[PDB]
Amino acid sequence: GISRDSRHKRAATGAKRAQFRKKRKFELGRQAANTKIGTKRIHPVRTRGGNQKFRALRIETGNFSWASEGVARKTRITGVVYHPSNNELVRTNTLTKAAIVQIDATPFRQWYESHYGQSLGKTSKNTERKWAARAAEAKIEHAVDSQFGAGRLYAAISSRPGQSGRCDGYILEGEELAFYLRRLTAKK
Amino acid sequence: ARGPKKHLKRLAAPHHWMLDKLSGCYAPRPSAGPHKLRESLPLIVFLRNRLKYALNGREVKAILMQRHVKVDGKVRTDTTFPAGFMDVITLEATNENFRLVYDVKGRFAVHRITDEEASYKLAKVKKVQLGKKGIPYVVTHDGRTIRYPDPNIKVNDTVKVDLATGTITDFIKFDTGKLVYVTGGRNLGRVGTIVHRERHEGGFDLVHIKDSLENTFVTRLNNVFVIGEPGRPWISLPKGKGIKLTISEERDRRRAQHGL
Amino acid sequence: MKLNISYPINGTQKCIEIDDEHRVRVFYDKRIGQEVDGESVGDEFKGYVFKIAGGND
RNA sequence: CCGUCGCUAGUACCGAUUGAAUGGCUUAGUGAGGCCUCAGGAUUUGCUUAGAGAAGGGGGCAACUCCAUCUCAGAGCGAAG
RNA sequence: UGAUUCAUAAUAACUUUUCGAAUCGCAUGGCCUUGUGCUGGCGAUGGUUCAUUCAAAUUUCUGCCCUAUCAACUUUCGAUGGUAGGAUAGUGGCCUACCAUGGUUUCAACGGGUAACGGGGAAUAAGGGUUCGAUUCCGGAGAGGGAGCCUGAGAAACGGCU
RNA sequence: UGAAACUGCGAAUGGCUCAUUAAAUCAGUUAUCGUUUAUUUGAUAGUUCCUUUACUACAUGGAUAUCUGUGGUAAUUCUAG
Ligand SMILES: [Mg+2]
Ligand SMILES: [Mg+2]
Ligand SMILES: [Mg+2]
Ligand SMILES: [Mg+2]
Ligand SMILES: [Mg+2]
Ligand SMILES: [Mg+2]
Ligand SMILES: [Mg+2]
Ligand SMILES: [Mg+2]
Ligand SMILES: [Mg+2]
Ligand SMILES: [Mg+2]
Ligand SMILES: [Mg+2]
Ligand SMILES: [Mg+2]
Ligand SMILES: [Mg+2]
Ligand SMILES: [Mg+2]
């Protein structure tokens, strides 16, 4: 029904291409998922070659990742903070790929407390040595720290949840992060 | 149309079957196997039109069921199993061991091979990749995939496969001046040495190849198969031995050799 | 009209044709998946308990 | 031999009828039916030790020398629907 | 490899944790720690991504019959391109958002007609040609029309459904 | 031995027809480093465990059809208990 035909689309010039054949299944495109954040729901869809393809619906949670540390966690999402394609996805609050979001962050904090164990926002004798050996490696780019303190880390989700089902993304760092922040500021 | 096509019409059937234009509507569609439809040979065509050990399709089927046929070690029961180039068909009653090898004209010649040679299969190299768990594996243009090949077995080389075990006896490196057998188009079935290799970035690597008669010809790399070193081929080739004579010459041969 | 009565454990069941309308009138405006008594349905059935499930227009 | 005006046939041309018909596009309004979707929950059951009558309801009066025990009021927790 | 963010292998997590043989026919072997113990043959089917084969969608280049009594068309309702998303098995204005104003055209765009399915080929036959090709082969469409979808590896199937 | 039925697979091939369709289809030619691919033959998974002093294995569960029975209908390759 909803097709991906280049049969329709007039032409490069403009001539109205007549309806050559009734559109096929292999040309199809399904209805959009546009996953929100409100109770965990998934529906698969039997695609071409069989092959299930999990559609995220109202997806809560997902493993958002650090770059500097090289880690990710069983972490909740809060809200759709800024989506750069369309702002209608921020009113309705529809999570998607490369939409900027705020991350529960508690899990991250916990992990840090194991990893380095110096705390963000503001025992045992040989493990002390280990701790000493670690830490003072990554100083973190201020904004991130603030987010951590808040309980709301700025990420960009990069799993396509309408295709994958999972809602796994990326803690924002550096220049891109800054840009995103700026955009957010402009919006608000 | 609407999915995979299941028939093969007798005119649309590939010519190197050498089928009758007449005598039924269809030809046997060679099923999914280790060889490409048109570059294959089904077990009906072999046991009916070539050998004539079966007078008809039913007979062939019966023979298959009896399980004296073995294409490459394993048994086979499918009428239309595509036995292709280099495949060794052994009929255990008769002991008529065959290797499917091309004639100079192009069609598959019935090569009545000995029992000791009909044992291995020479086969080309289509790919060299690594699979899961970091294991390097070679692929053959003649069907098989063999795990763990001698690191210096690269693409378009040839490989003597033990066949019974399905391993690697030996290999020939593709290079200048190494006996080669042809499997494509106008030069299909000839045999030669290899002179050049026109490299060409993307668009088909050519190969200038001379035969025993010093007659040059060119083919694409995919249409060439390395059969040995000049003088010593690794397989017994049929009468003619990939020479391919001129028409006039052929005629002369025909009308000189009148031995009643 | 007709009735379609079946016992589970014994595995024995029967036709009960009912031309008398009063008897029929017990089941009106019930729904598939409910319980019924024996005595109101007829004089032959007394003490029994039907379970209304299934039927046909 | 050329025109006008006559008679007899036929071809097309224009042409009021607010003509008629078929199809192709098409405004506005409606909008069947499925697909996803928000819910919705007929029914089907598992696991909970949840008290039985049970006549060795685990190898001889007894929390059976208590057995996937006799089995429904449980109710909780699901899964499918 | 002509060429990669390739093959592929590690570190990190998530996962409404896929898969990981409570499977059917013959045959009934080998060690005694003499239990019926531990053991082992010929096969069937399934099941993972990688091959292959059968294929599959697209896709590059070049090539169509008549018409100016069709010279502008496309672009409100995607036209051309971008960026991002969405979707798709995947590429892609395929769809959405935001922006730019492109894109095609007398080397006939666009429109109209075809008593046009395309090609292999057919008839004619000095050479060049001209006409025909519904029709045994290859492709493509369609199953009264138009729409929509289930199942399925593969259908927008019509000897399936709505 | 085997009716019936559930599971499997097949029914998307083939056959027909030429209505549309004029850079569309189609012809040769490339490409998928741009993808799916039952079937095919080749391949192949000690890590399911989650603190490690008493725990599901020489075989786990309840269904549903054939049937047999209780039927409706004016009827339909109709199917309710
Ligand atoms: Mg698959
Ligand atoms: Mg290439
Ligand atoms: Mg990679
Ligand atoms: Mg894109
Ligand atoms: Mg024509
Ligand atoms: Mg037509
Ligand atoms: Mg034609
Ligand atoms: Mg016609
Ligand atoms: Mg045809
Ligand atoms: Mg008709
Ligand atoms: Mg249809
Ligand atoms: Mg019919
Ligand atoms: Mg059909
Ligand atoms: Mg067909």
Rounded distance, CA A179 to CA B244, Å? 72
Contact indicator for B38, B84 with CB cutoff of 8 Å: no
Query: Which of residues 85 to 124 on B have a Cβ less than 7 angstroms from any strand F atom?
Result: none
Ranges of beta strands (E only) in A47-174 are 55-57, 77-82, 100-103, 153-157, 169-171
Do B207 and B158 lie in a common domain?
no
Cα A100–Cα A106–Cα A112 angle in degrees, nearest 5: 100
Rounded distance, CA B233 to CA B215, Å? 19
- Chains linked to C by 3 or more Cβ pairs within 8 Å: none
Contact indicator for B252, B260 with CB cutoff of 8 Å: no
Q: Residue type for B137, please?
A: Y
**Helix axis angle, A143-150 to A174-187, nearest 10°:** 60
SS3 C56: coil
Count of residues making up chain C? 57
Alpha carbon B136 to chain centroid, angstroms? 26
Q: Residue type for A84, please?
A: P
Does residue B257 sit within a domain?
no
Q: What are the φ/ψ torsions at residue B114 (nearest 5 degrees)?
A: -65, 160
- Method of determination is cryo-EM
Rounded distance, CA C47 to CA C50, Å? 10
Residue with tokens 């009308």: B255
Query: Which of residues 62 to 91 on A have a Cβ less than 7 angstroms from any strand E atom?
Result: 62-63, 65, 70-74, 83-89
Class of domain A106-151: mainly alpha
Ligand nearest to the CA of A49: 1
Assigned token pair, A153 = 């880390």
Residue with tokens 């987010």: A147
Q: Tally Cβ neighbours within 10 Å of residue B127.
A: 11
Assigned token pair, B225 = 């198969």
Task: Find and list the nucleotides of strand F having atoms within 7 Å of a protein beta carbon.
Answer: 11-15, 20-25, 30-31, 36-45, 69-73, 80-81
The residues near A33 (Cβ < 8 Å, ≥ 6 apart) are A55, A56, A57, A161, A162
Resolution in A: 3.8
Q: How many domains does chain B have?
A: 3
Cα A109–Cα A111–Cα A114 angle in degrees, nearest 5: 115
Task: Find and list the nucleotides of strand D having atoms within 7 Å of a protein beta carbon.
Answer: 25, 33-39, 42-43
SS3 A20: coil
Q: Residue type for B198, please?
A: E
Assigned token pair, B58 = 């039913």
Rounded distance, CA B117 to CA B101, Å? 14
Find the nucleotide nearest B30 (Cα to C1′): E54
Task: Find and list the nucleotides of strand E having atoms within 7 Å of a protein beta carbon.
Answer: 1-3, 7-16, 49-59, 73-75, 78-80, 84-98, 103-104, 109-111, 120, 136-143, 146-149, 151-158
Rounded distance, CA B40 to CA B8, Å? 14
Name the β-bridge partners of B219.
Answer: B207
Rounded distance, CA B93 to CA B194, Å? 40
Rounded distance, CA A105 to CA A64, Å? 10
SS3 B224: strand
Rounded to whole angstroms, the distance from the CA of residue B116 to the C1' of nucleotide E40 is 33
C7's enclosing H/E stretch is strand C2-7
Contact indicator for B50, B108 with CB cutoff of 8 Å: yes
What are the sequence ranges of the domains in chain A?
1-30, 31-105+152-188, 106-151
B217's enclosing H/E stretch is strand B216-220
Contact indicator for B61, B79 with CB cutoff of 8 Å: yes
Assigned token pair, A149 = 């303190």
Alpha carbon A43 to chain centroid, angstroms? 19
Do B191 and B142 lie in a common domain?
no
Do B107 and B25 lie in a common domain?
yes
- CA–centroid distance, A23 to ligand 6, in Å, is 21
Rounded distance, CA A143 to CA A184, Å? 13
Rounded distance, CA B175 to CA B229, Å? 10
Q: Tally Cβ neighbours within 10 Å of residue A34.
A: 18
End-to-end CA distance of chain A: give it in Å, rounded.
39
- Chains linked to A by 3 or more Cβ pairs within 8 Å: none
DSSP assignment letter at C1: -
Ligand nearest to the CA of A46: 1
Q: Residue type for C40, please?
A: S
Rounded distance, CA A45 to CA A31, Å? 11
Q: Tally Cβ neighbours within 10 Å of residue A143.
A: 17
Rounded distance, CA A160 to CA A163, Å? 6
B84 touches strand F (CB under 7 A): no
Contact indicator for B136, B130 with CB cutoff of 8 Å: yes
Query: Which of residues 207 to 226 on B have a Cβ less than 7 angstroms from any strand F atom?
Result: none
- CA–centroid distance, B7 to ligand 14, in Å, is 10
Rounded to whole angstroms, the distance from the CA of residue A34 to the C1' of nucleotide F55 is 47
Assigned token pair, B229 = 């070193």
Do B12 and B89 lie in a common domain?
yes
Rounded distance, CA B32 to CA A125, Å? 67
Which of B116, B142, B162 delimits the end of a domain? B116
Rounded distance, CA B171 to CA B176, Å? 16
Rounded distance, CA B43 to CA B98, Å? 12
Supply the DSSP string of B91-156, one letter for each residue: ETTTTEEEEEEE-SSSSEEEEE--TTTBTBEEEE--EEEE-GGG-EEEE-TTS-EEES--SS--TT
Does residue B64 sit within a domain?
yes
* Domain around B195: 174-244
Contact indicator for B209, B193 with CB cutoff of 8 Å: yes
Q: What are the φ/ψ torsions at residue B32 (nearest 5 degrees)?
A: -60, 125
Does residue B97 sit within a domain?
yes
Rounded to whole angstroms, the distance from the CA of residue A10 to the C1' of nucleotide F22 is 15
Does residue B260 sit within a domain?
no
Rounded distance, CA A124 to CA A122, Å? 24
Assigned token pair, B13 = 């059937």
A183's enclosing H/E stretch is helix A174-187
A92 touches strand E (CB under 7 A): no
B38 touches strand E (CB under 7 A): yes
- Provide the CATH number for the domain around residue B70: 3.10.290.10
A163's enclosing H/E stretch is helix A161-164
SS3 B252: helix
B26's enclosing H/E stretch is strand B26-27
Rounded distance, CA A65 to CA B179, Å? 58
Q: Tally Cβ neighbours within 10 Å of residue B149.
A: 19
